[PDB]
Amino acid sequence: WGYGKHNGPEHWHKDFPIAKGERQSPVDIDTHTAKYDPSLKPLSVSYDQATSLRILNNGHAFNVEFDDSQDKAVLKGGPLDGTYRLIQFHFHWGSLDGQGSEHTVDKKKYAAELHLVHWNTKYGDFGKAVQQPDGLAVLGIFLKVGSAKPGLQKVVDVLDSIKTKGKSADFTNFDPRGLLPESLDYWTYPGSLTTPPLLECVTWIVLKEPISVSSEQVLKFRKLNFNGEGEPEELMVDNWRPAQPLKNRQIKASF
Ligand SMILES: [Hg+2]
Ligand SMILES: [Zn+2]
């Protein structure tokens, strides 16, 4: 799998037949169709005690890893029942500014999209959560091209270091709190991971309010490579999956 012409999302079904499943992500968020649910409590983001370990180029994107051996960086409340631990964050960006986001809002695409992955602590480890219908909780954050995001610059500078798939670098004392928007207004629906295995274990929480980043901050993302060192260079762009059919599922709004 990849995002290329012959291994793109349109081919994932042959290896991961769940691609054509019942609760696949991402989707289009029809705002007029979304249902305002008043029984939704506000989001609870406790990242004050977060511990980042490193950043790796996995060949499909770059991941920032955190220590999830203790309730250090957690998400609870909202549509969730129980505590969800942060394990990693990554992005999906486009080749141009008119694309990159996975999830869409009234068919509108953003420059990039941030995913904060968390796993349900009653399951013990990430590996066991992916075997559950309520296994994961991902926090979706859209990025638009504007003024620079000071809190994202640390991530941006270390990229020179992980240009190719396989590369990784020490990356401690990173506060995710810096990538959060002002409002925590959200949309929530049942879905999956948006890259193979596409496990239908995720509870999506997409915030209404996007963060803005500079053209230069987004430009460094596009300098990444899918390939490993010493292989023909194929730039890491359009690492996003097209929107899937909603299929009965309903999107609730917390606002
Ligand atoms: Hg699952
Ligand atoms: Zn993702």
Side-chain angles (χ1 to χ4, degrees):
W1 71 273
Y3 302 90
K5 189 55 176 184
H6 293 93
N7 59 348
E10 57 280 349
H11 289 258
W12 302 347
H13 70 102
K14 299 166 283 177
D15 274 309
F16 315 89
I18 197 155
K20 303 206 151 204
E22 287 310 282
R23 49 172 290 187
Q24 285 285 294
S25 312
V27 308
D28 177 53
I29 286 138
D30 187 345
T31 71
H32 298 106
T33 294
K35 210 288 189 190
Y36 166 84
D37 177 5
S39 69
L40 265 40
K41 310 136 198 169
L43 271 187
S44 207
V45 192
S46 304
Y47 296 159
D48 50 298
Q49 215 74 239
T51 300
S52 60
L53 298 182
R54 46 109 105 161
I55 186 156
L56 172 95
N57 182 319
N58 61 34
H60 65 259
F62 69 81
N63 283 207
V64 177
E65 306 172 353
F66 296 65
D67 164 32
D68 68 337
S69 64
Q70 291 185 100
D71 286 17
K72 292 173 176 163
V74 300
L75 197 222
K76 39 183 162 57
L80 317 176
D81 294 309
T83 317
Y84 287 73
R85 277 190 192 155
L86 166 67
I87 195 183
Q88 56 98 340
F89 71 69
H90 42 274
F91 301 84
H92 301 269
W93 55 92
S95 42
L96 290 304
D97 294 343
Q99 56 178 53
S101 59
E102 299 208 282
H103 284 84
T104 58
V105 181
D106 292 329
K107 291 297 220 281
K108 160 188 168 65
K109 321 176 158 47
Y110 288 89
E113 186 168 329
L114 171 49
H115 297 146
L116 292 133
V117 190
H118 319 64
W119 54 274
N120 195 336
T121 56
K122 90 209 79 162
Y123 305 120
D125 67 74
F126 180 84
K128 289 298 206 157
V130 298
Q131 297 177 187
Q132 306 294 155
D134 70 346
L136 301 188
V138 179
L139 216 204
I141 307 184
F142 299 122
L143 280 60
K144 46 172 176 160
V145 162
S147 309
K149 180 65 138 153
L152 181 65
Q153 198 65 39
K154 277 185 68 192
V155 177
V156 162
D157 297 324
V158 66
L159 293 185
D160 274 333
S161 303
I162 61 155
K163 184 177 176 72
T164 63
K165 173 184 177 44
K167 302 309 210 179
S168 73
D170 292 344
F171 195 78
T172 30
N173 323 100
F174 182 80
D175 188 351
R177 280 180 310 172
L179 307 177
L180 308 182
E182 177 172 325
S183 183
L184 298 195
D185 282 342
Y186 64 91
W187 295 290
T188 193
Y189 81 99
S192 64
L193 286 177
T194 57
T195 77
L198 303 176
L199 305 172
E200 297 184 321
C201 308
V202 189
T203 297
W204 277 96
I205 318 181
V206 196
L207 306 317
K208 181 169 55 163
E209 185 183 336
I211 52 159
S212 62
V213 301
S214 75
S215 136
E216 24 283 301
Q217 301 190 296
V218 77
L219 263 177
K220 274 159 166 176
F221 278 38
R222 299 168 185 153
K223 290 179 165 151
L224 288 66
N225 293 173
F226 282 122
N227 67 269
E229 188 182 13
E231 312 177 340
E233 181 168 28
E234 161 189 24
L235 308 178
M236 192 183 286
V237 277
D238 299 328
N239 59 341
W240 57 264
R241 177 198 194 177
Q244 308 298 302
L246 198 44
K247 294 184 168 142
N248 85 218
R249 287 179 301 181
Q250 187 194 42
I251 301 170
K252 299 187 192 181
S254 80
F255 60 102

Tab-separated table of all heavy atoms in Angstrom, residues 3 60-61 63 88-92 102 113-117 138 192-195 204 239, ligand 2:
chain	number	residue	atom	x	y	z
A	3	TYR	N	0.096	5.657	-1.643
A	3	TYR	CA	-0.810	6.685	-2.145
A	3	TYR	C	-0.523	6.981	-3.611
A	3	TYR	O	-1.014	7.965	-4.163
A	3	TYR	CB	-0.682	7.982	-1.304
A	3	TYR	CG	-0.981	7.739	0.157
A	3	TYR	CD1	0.008	7.374	1.075
A	3	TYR	CD2	-2.298	7.855	0.609
A	3	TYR	CE1	-0.304	7.130	2.406
A	3	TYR	CE2	-2.620	7.637	1.941
A	3	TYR	CZ	-1.628	7.272	2.839
A	3	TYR	OH	-2.001	7.065	4.135
A	60	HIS	N	4.974	6.543	5.320
A	60	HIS	CA	3.616	6.987	4.912
A	60	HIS	C	3.347	8.340	5.597
A	60	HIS	O	2.431	9.086	5.185
A	60	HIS	CB	2.478	6.001	5.150
A	60	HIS	CG	2.186	5.683	6.582
A	60	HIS	ND1	2.589	4.545	7.223
A	60	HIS	CD2	1.484	6.397	7.490
A	60	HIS	CE1	2.161	4.576	8.475
A	60	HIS	NE2	1.493	5.685	8.671
A	61	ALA	N	4.156	8.630	6.594
A	61	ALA	CA	4.074	9.894	7.332
A	61	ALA	C	5.096	9.848	8.479
A	61	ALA	O	5.832	8.854	8.592
A	61	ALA	CB	2.666	10.174	7.823
A	63	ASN	N	5.487	10.265	12.620
A	63	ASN	CA	4.870	10.063	13.901
A	63	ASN	C	5.776	10.540	15.063
A	63	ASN	O	6.979	10.278	15.103
A	63	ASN	CB	4.573	8.580	14.128
A	63	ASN	CG	3.381	8.004	13.416
A	63	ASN	OD1	2.783	7.016	13.892
A	63	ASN	ND2	3.012	8.572	12.279
A	88	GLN	N	0.486	8.525	19.999
A	88	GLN	CA	1.149	9.190	18.861
A	88	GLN	C	0.257	10.193	18.150
A	88	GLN	O	-0.976	10.187	18.296
A	88	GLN	CB	1.670	8.145	17.876
A	88	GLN	CG	0.706	7.126	17.300
A	88	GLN	CD	0.168	7.452	15.941
A	88	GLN	OE1	0.173	8.590	15.454
A	88	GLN	NE2	-0.335	6.434	15.251
A	89	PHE	N	0.883	11.043	17.371
A	89	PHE	CA	0.210	12.063	16.543
A	89	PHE	C	0.978	12.011	15.200
A	89	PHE	O	2.165	11.622	15.189
A	89	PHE	CB	0.079	13.450	17.081
A	89	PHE	CG	1.186	14.426	17.260
A	89	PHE	CD1	1.834	14.989	16.155
A	89	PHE	CD2	1.570	14.857	18.537
A	89	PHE	CE1	2.844	15.928	16.297
A	89	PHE	CE2	2.586	15.799	18.700
A	89	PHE	CZ	3.224	16.344	17.554
A	90	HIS	N	0.273	12.363	14.163
A	90	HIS	CA	0.818	12.400	12.791
A	90	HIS	C	-0.035	13.364	11.982
A	90	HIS	O	-1.030	13.896	12.480
A	90	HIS	CB	0.907	11.057	12.043
A	90	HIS	CG	-0.307	10.221	12.266
A	90	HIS	ND1	-0.464	9.359	13.341
A	90	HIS	CD2	-1.438	10.128	11.525
A	90	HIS	CE1	-1.642	8.777	13.251
A	90	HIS	NE2	-2.254	9.208	12.175
A	91	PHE	N	0.361	13.541	10.734
A	91	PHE	CA	-0.371	14.459	9.841
A	91	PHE	C	-0.583	13.759	8.505
A	91	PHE	O	0.024	12.719	8.213
A	91	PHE	CB	0.378	15.768	9.710
A	91	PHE	CG	0.681	16.622	10.896
A	91	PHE	CD1	1.801	16.372	11.698
A	91	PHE	CD2	-0.145	17.697	11.221
A	91	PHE	CE1	2.099	17.164	12.794
A	91	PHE	CE2	0.141	18.524	12.317
A	91	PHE	CZ	1.281	18.248	13.100
A	92	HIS	N	-1.456	14.369	7.742
A	92	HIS	CA	-1.892	14.072	6.401
A	92	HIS	C	-1.870	15.461	5.732
A	92	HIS	O	-2.576	16.326	6.274
A	92	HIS	CB	-3.312	13.498	6.168
A	92	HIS	CG	-3.405	12.211	6.926
A	92	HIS	ND1	-3.083	10.988	6.396
A	92	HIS	CD2	-3.753	11.995	8.210
A	92	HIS	CE1	-3.238	10.071	7.335
A	92	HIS	NE2	-3.644	10.662	8.428
A	102	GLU	N	-8.253	14.763	5.383
A	102	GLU	CA	-8.905	13.485	5.123
A	102	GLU	C	-10.420	13.665	5.204
A	102	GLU	O	-11.176	13.289	4.300
A	102	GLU	CB	-8.443	12.407	6.098
A	102	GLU	CG	-6.966	12.048	6.113
A	102	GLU	CD	-6.624	10.650	6.540
A	102	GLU	OE1	-6.585	10.177	7.665
A	102	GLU	OE2	-6.365	9.977	5.522
A	113	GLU	N	-4.273	17.801	7.991
A	113	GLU	CA	-5.084	17.325	9.123
A	113	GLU	C	-4.219	16.570	10.124
A	113	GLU	O	-3.435	15.683	9.791
A	113	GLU	CB	-6.213	16.406	8.707
A	113	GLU	CG	-7.217	15.962	9.803
A	113	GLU	CD	-8.434	15.312	9.187
A	113	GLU	OE1	-8.811	15.668	8.082
A	113	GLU	OE2	-8.929	14.422	9.906
A	114	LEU	N	-4.398	16.936	11.377
A	114	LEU	CA	-3.711	16.391	12.522
A	114	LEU	C	-4.507	15.332	13.255
A	114	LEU	O	-5.669	15.608	13.646
A	114	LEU	CB	-3.414	17.619	13.444
A	114	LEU	CG	-2.883	17.257	14.828
A	114	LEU	CD1	-1.743	16.256	14.737
A	114	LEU	CD2	-2.413	18.552	15.486
A	115	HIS	N	-3.904	14.181	13.464
A	115	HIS	CA	-4.556	13.114	14.213
A	115	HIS	C	-3.752	12.790	15.483
A	115	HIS	O	-2.559	12.477	15.416
A	115	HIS	CB	-4.843	11.809	13.434
A	115	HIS	CG	-5.805	12.072	12.307
A	115	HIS	ND1	-5.814	11.455	11.096
A	115	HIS	CD2	-6.788	13.019	12.238
A	115	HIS	CE1	-6.744	11.950	10.332
A	115	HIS	NE2	-7.348	12.916	10.995
A	116	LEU	N	-4.476	12.851	16.583
A	116	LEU	CA	-3.959	12.514	17.928
A	116	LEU	C	-4.642	11.173	18.276
A	116	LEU	O	-5.872	11.136	18.502
A	116	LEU	CB	-4.199	13.659	18.879
A	116	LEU	CG	-3.405	14.950	18.645
A	116	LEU	CD1	-4.321	16.161	18.722
A	116	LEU	CD2	-2.309	15.081	19.688
A	117	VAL	N	-3.839	10.119	18.287
A	117	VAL	CA	-4.356	8.767	18.547
A	117	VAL	C	-4.235	8.418	20.027
A	117	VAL	O	-3.150	8.656	20.650
A	117	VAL	CB	-3.623	7.744	17.659
A	117	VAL	CG1	-4.281	6.369	17.715
A	117	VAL	CG2	-3.439	8.233	16.230
A	138	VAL	N	-9.595	9.130	18.359
A	138	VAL	CA	-8.672	9.990	17.591
A	138	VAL	C	-9.240	11.407	17.592
A	138	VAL	O	-10.451	11.585	17.459
A	138	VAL	CB	-8.446	9.403	16.190
A	138	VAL	CG1	-7.507	10.293	15.382
A	138	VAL	CG2	-7.992	7.965	16.244
A	192	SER	N	-13.029	4.348	11.527
A	192	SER	CA	-11.807	3.572	11.542
A	192	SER	C	-10.537	4.412	11.365
A	192	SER	O	-10.525	5.652	11.206
A	192	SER	CB	-11.806	2.586	10.367
A	192	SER	OG	-11.791	3.311	9.127
A	193	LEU	N	-9.455	3.636	11.359
A	193	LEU	CA	-8.105	4.203	11.090
A	193	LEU	C	-8.241	4.554	9.609
A	193	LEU	O	-9.126	3.906	8.976
A	193	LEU	CB	-7.066	3.167	11.491
A	193	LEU	CG	-6.918	3.041	13.010
A	193	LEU	CD1	-5.930	1.953	13.419
A	193	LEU	CD2	-6.450	4.392	13.548
A	194	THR	N	-7.490	5.505	9.130
A	194	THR	CA	-7.605	5.900	7.715
A	194	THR	C	-6.444	5.428	6.871
A	194	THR	O	-6.252	5.910	5.732
A	194	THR	CB	-7.932	7.432	7.593
A	194	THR	OG1	-6.889	8.179	8.281
A	194	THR	CG2	-9.324	7.785	8.161
A	195	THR	N	-5.701	4.461	7.374
A	195	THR	CA	-4.570	3.827	6.699
A	195	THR	C	-4.643	2.360	7.157
A	195	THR	O	-5.065	2.134	8.296
A	195	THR	CB	-3.139	4.429	6.971
A	195	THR	OG1	-2.750	3.952	8.304
A	195	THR	CG2	-3.008	5.949	6.934
A	204	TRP	N	-14.356	8.943	16.280
A	204	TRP	CA	-13.776	10.203	15.779
A	204	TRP	C	-14.374	11.423	16.466
A	204	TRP	O	-15.586	11.538	16.699
A	204	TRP	CB	-13.929	10.281	14.255
A	204	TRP	CG	-12.854	9.558	13.525
A	204	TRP	CD1	-12.881	8.287	13.025
A	204	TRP	CD2	-11.553	10.093	13.228
A	204	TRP	NE1	-11.670	7.991	12.436
A	204	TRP	CE2	-10.844	9.078	12.540
A	204	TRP	CE3	-10.929	11.303	13.499
A	204	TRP	CZ2	-9.536	9.258	12.099
A	204	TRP	CZ3	-9.630	11.498	13.072
A	204	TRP	CH2	-8.955	10.483	12.380
A	239	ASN	N	-0.789	12.243	1.222
A	239	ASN	CA	-0.777	11.013	2.046
A	239	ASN	C	-2.148	10.957	2.746
A	239	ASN	O	-2.205	10.731	3.962
A	239	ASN	CB	0.389	10.971	3.024
A	239	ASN	CG	0.422	12.143	3.998
A	239	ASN	OD1	-0.196	13.190	3.766
A	239	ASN	ND2	1.129	12.018	5.124
B	2	ZN	ZN	-4.243	9.691	10.457
